[PDB]
Design an enzyme around this catalytic site. Structure first.
Site, PDB file in Angstrom:
ATOM      1  N   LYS A  52       2.086 -10.014   7.533  1.00 21.45           N
ATOM      2  CA  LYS A  52       1.752  -8.694   8.037  1.00 21.45           C
ATOM      3  C   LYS A  52       0.666  -8.851   9.093  1.00 21.45           C
ATOM      4  CE  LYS A  52       0.325  -4.009   6.779  1.00 21.45           C
ATOM      5  NZ  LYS A  52       0.191  -3.017   5.684  1.00 21.45           N
ATOM      6  N   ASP A  79       1.981   7.925  -3.507  1.00 21.54           N
ATOM      7  CA  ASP A  79       3.090   7.977  -2.553  1.00 21.54           C
ATOM      8  C   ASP A  79       4.159   6.915  -2.884  1.00 21.54           C
ATOM      9  OD1 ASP A  79       4.166   9.344  -0.181  1.00 21.54           O
ATOM     10  OD2 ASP A  79       3.738   7.498   0.942  1.00 21.54           O
TER      11      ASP A  79
END
Ligand SMILES: CN1CCC(Oc2ccc(-c3[nH]nc4cccc(OCC5CCCCC5)c34)cc2)CC1
Length: 261
Positions: free
Chosen positions: A39, A133
């Site tokens: 990432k 979420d």
């Protein structure tokens, strides 16, 4: 032929699998041709609260490594004022792309995947983290088991090869603190509902404003069609209770016949 250097080690990029606002996830190979996911976060145009969320996410990922193997492995990381590089384990496919392929889901595989999800979310709840979420894209399939990718602290990323309100709990809609570990139970219940009937509890409502009303509406009864696994029908009903105090908890879910029998 493009390369990435992290803490002295050089990695060769295979393909870009994800991209966000300032972040990118790449499928990479080391010198020994071992697969990893890296990432990259560009910090050049990033505010103090955006910078803090990435710092808090790296810290919690590093800490929760030793507590559960159902959390993505973070082997190494490089953080400067200009960028972030995170060397993580590479999975086969995320749960969202896997479920979008439809086909037939085995009851044994669905039960095994549900156990992994409960363990990962249980581990983050024990260290005072509530995701808020959760969606199938937050889960990764590695060595036949599900692993939690993020803790919902940092910004979400879209695939490469538009988000959803289907997994949003009614407390989050009734609000705007009412957010507690029970909010993650609802979202987990929505993913299990998708794994059982091939659709989310409010997927029939294509309209987004009419969908938000149905999640908080007590008269809007969620359909639970009869299936051979009666224990599975109970967990779904208990997870999708609009009242958070009446909703089943993670420790109760771990003692439920669906995962124990
Ligand atoms: C559409 N397509 C993509 C590639 C592939 O699936 C993945 C493979 C690896 C991975 C992954 N491993 N480690 C990972 C560590 C961090 C983030 C990761 O992804 C994030 C983002 C990627 C796309 C879907 C949502 C999550 C990570 C994840 C999806 C097949 C399907």
């Amino acid at each position: 032929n493009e390369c990435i250097s992290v803490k002295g080690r050089i990695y060769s990029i295979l393909k870009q699998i994800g991209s966000g606002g300032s972040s990118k996830v790449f499928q990479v190979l080391n010198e020994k041709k071992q697969i990893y996911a890296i990432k990259y976060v560009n910090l050049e145009e990033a505010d103090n609260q955006t910078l803090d969320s990435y710092r808090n996410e790296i810290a919690y990922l590093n800490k929760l490594q030793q507590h559960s193997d159902k959390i993505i492995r973070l082997y190494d990381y490089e953080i400067t004022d200009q960028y972030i590089y995170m060397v993580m384990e590479c999975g086969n496919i995320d749960l969202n792309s896997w479920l979008k392929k439809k086909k037939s889901i085995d009851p044994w595989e669905r039960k095994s995947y549900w156990k992994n999800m409960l363990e990962a979310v249980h581990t983050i709840h024990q260290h005072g983290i509530v995701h808020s979420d959760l969606k199938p894209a937050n889960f990764l399939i590695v060595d036949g088991m599900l692993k939690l990718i993020d803790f919902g602290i940092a910004n979400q990323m879209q695939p490469d090869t538009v988000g959803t309100v289907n997994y949003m709990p009614p407390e989050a809609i009734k609000d705007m603190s009412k957010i507690s570990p029970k909010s993650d139970v609802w979202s987990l219940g929505c993913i299990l509902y998708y794994m059982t009937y091939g659709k989310t509890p409010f997927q029939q409502i294509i309209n987004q404003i009419s969908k938000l009303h149905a999640i908080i509406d007590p008269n809007h009864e969620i359909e639970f069609p009869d299936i051979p696994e009666k224990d599975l029908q109970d967990v779904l009903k208990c997870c999708l209770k609009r009242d958070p105090k009446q909703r089943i908890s993670i420790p109760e879910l771990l003692a439920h016949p669906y995962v124990q029998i």
